[PDB]
């Protein structure tokens, strides 16, 4: 809503309790030999293409 | 109990069964 | 909204040095219903603008020709 | 229940050097029948406390004393 970057940054970290990691990072974290494992079905079933 | 829920998430909850 | 915090910058340059030619071209700034702190920061910004302006002129006036054709006799 | 062996630390250093300052701040040592050597160790500890305080004060003055704009006009 306004063009100034510092207060944009400070409005994101203001003692943040919950820091949810993006799902893409959760995909690229684990290697292949458990990405096929059925424990990661919650990541697998949204990998379609 | 939340740690228990994490453990039950990260593993599974004829076929020739095998103990370890 | 806000800015960076101000850096230290100890002293007042116009308090100590009256011998630069930039002094009468500084004094025209005066407060009008303004607290003296932000008015002083306005003086500081005008002073740094003037010294940048003066050193800019000092650069461009010595670099039209740093050599010249006319100095061959002397 | 005890401490280290004491180091060598020889001589009455304050008496051989009356020229230094802070010795008027040293002479306020009352003796309520303290023996003749633990009083000397108390005096030594008070002396090194005083010279550390004097050195810290002179360092504080040497760090607040930076080249100012006022002193550079010479």
Curated annotation (Swiss-Prot), chain B:
Highest taxon of the lineage: Viruses
Compartments in which it is found: Virion; Host nucleus
Similarity comment: Belongs to the herpesviridae major capsid protein family.
Role played: Self-assembles to form an icosahedral capsid with a T=16 symmetry, about 200 nm in diameter, and consisting of 150 hexons and 12 pentons (total of 162 capsomers). Hexons form the edges and faces of the capsid and are each composed of six MCP molecules. In contrast, one penton is found at each of the 12 vertices. Eleven of the pentons are MCP pentamers, while the last vertex is occupied by the portal complex.
Summary of subunit composition and partner proteins: Homomultimer. Makes the hexons and eleven out of twelve pentons. Interacts with triplex proteins 1/TRX1 and 2/TRX2; adjacent capsomers are linked together in groups of three by triplexes, heterotrimeric complexes composed of one molecule of TRX1 and two molecules of TRX2. Interacts with scaffold protein; this interaction allows efficient MCP transport to the host nucleus. Interacts with capsid vertex component 2/CVC2. Interacts with the small capsomere-interacting protein/SCP.
Protein name, per record: Major capsid protein
Organism: Epstein-Barr virus (strain B95-8)
Name of the gene encoding the protein in the UniProt record: MCP
First-to-last residue of the parent protein present: 1136 to 1184 of 1381
From Swiss-Prot, chains C, D:
Subcellular compartments: Virion; Host nucleus
Protein name: Small capsomere-interacting protein
Family: Belongs to the herpesviridae small capsomere-interacting protein family.
Gene Ontology terms describing biological process: viral process
Recorded name of the encoding gene: SCP
Main subcellular location: virion
Keyword hit for Ribonucleoprotein: no
Function: Participates in the assembly of the infectious particles by decorating the outer surface of the capsid shell and thus forming a layer between the capsid and the tegument. Complexes composed of the major capsid protein and small capsomere-interacting protein/SCP assemble together in the host cytoplasm and are translocated to the nucleus, where they accumulate and participate in capsid assembly.
Source organism of the structure: Epstein-Barr virus (strain B95-8) (HHV-4)
Quaternary organization: Interacts with the major capsid protein/MCP.
């Amino acid at each position: 809503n306004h063009m100034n970057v510092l207060v944009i940054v400070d409005e994101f970290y203001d003692n943040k309790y919950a820091a949810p990691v993006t799902d893409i990072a959760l995909k690229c974290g684990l290697p292949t030999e458990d990405f096929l494992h059925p424990s990661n079905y919650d990541l697998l079933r949204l990998e379609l293409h | 109990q939340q740690v228990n829920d994490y453990i039950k998430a990260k593993v599974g909850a004829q076929q020739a069964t095998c103990e370890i | 909204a806000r800015r960076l915090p101000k850096p230290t910058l100890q002293g007042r340059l116009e308090a100590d040095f009256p011998d630069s030619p930039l002094l009468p071209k500084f004094q025209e700034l005066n407060q009008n219903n303004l607290p003296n702190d932000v008015f002083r920061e306005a003086q500081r910004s005008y002073l740094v603008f003037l010294t940048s302006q003066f050193c800019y002129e000092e650069y461009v006036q010595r670099t039209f020709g740093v050599p010249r054709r006319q100095r061959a006799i002397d």
